[PDB]
Amino acid sequence: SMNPPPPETSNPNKPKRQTNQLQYLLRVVLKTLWKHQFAWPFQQPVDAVKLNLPDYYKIIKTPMDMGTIKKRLENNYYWNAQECIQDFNTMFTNCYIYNKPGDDIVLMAEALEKLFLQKINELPTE
Numbered sequence: 532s533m534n535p536p537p538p539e540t541s542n543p544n545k546p547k548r549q550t551n552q553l554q555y556l557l558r559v560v561l562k563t564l565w566k567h568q569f570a571w572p573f574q575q576p577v578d579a580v581k582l583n584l585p586d587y588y589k590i591i592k593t594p595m596d597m598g599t600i601k602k603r604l605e606n607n608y609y610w611n612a613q614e615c616i617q618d619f620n621t622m623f624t625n626c627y628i629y630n631k632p633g634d635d636i637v638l639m640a641e642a643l644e645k646l647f648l649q650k651i652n653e654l655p656t657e
């Protein structure tokens with residue numbers, strides 16, 4: 532088994548901005564999820580070798596994680612909040628796609644997602 536390369540967090544010819552909605556995604560939306568007791572599986576790319584989950588990346592073709600999302604926010608990778616919000620949703624969705632209802636990991640994802648939804652509710656106007 533092998534892990535793929537992680538998602539890129541740097542791309543010089545990608546257009547970037549530092550919008551207030553994007554400043555908010557880092558300061559409220561990501562920093563809220565990051566500190567949570569259930570954040571740890573989501574803090575780095577899934578290591579399918581360490582976990583002995585050789586199927587992971589045969590199933591999940593758009594991996595995403597908060598380690599990547601954090602690096603993207605810090606390295607001003609994004610153009611808009613919707614690109615960043617899409618990364619969060621991809622992260623949650625991947626978890627639900629790969630894992631069975633009632634798995635501990637799904638309960639963890641579901642806790643974080645509740646907060647995530649609660650924070651994006653008060654995303655400022657651009």
Ligand SMILES: CCc1cc2c(s1)-[n+]1c(n[nH]c1C)CN=C2c1ccccc1Cl
Nearest residue numbers: 571572573577578582626629630635636
């Ligand atoms: C940090 C190490 C990880 C463990 C797990 C990770 S990532 N995971 C998986 N699917 N999506 C994500 C993210 C596979 N299940 C787990 C996992 C999490 C909690 C308890 C047990 C497991 Cl087995």
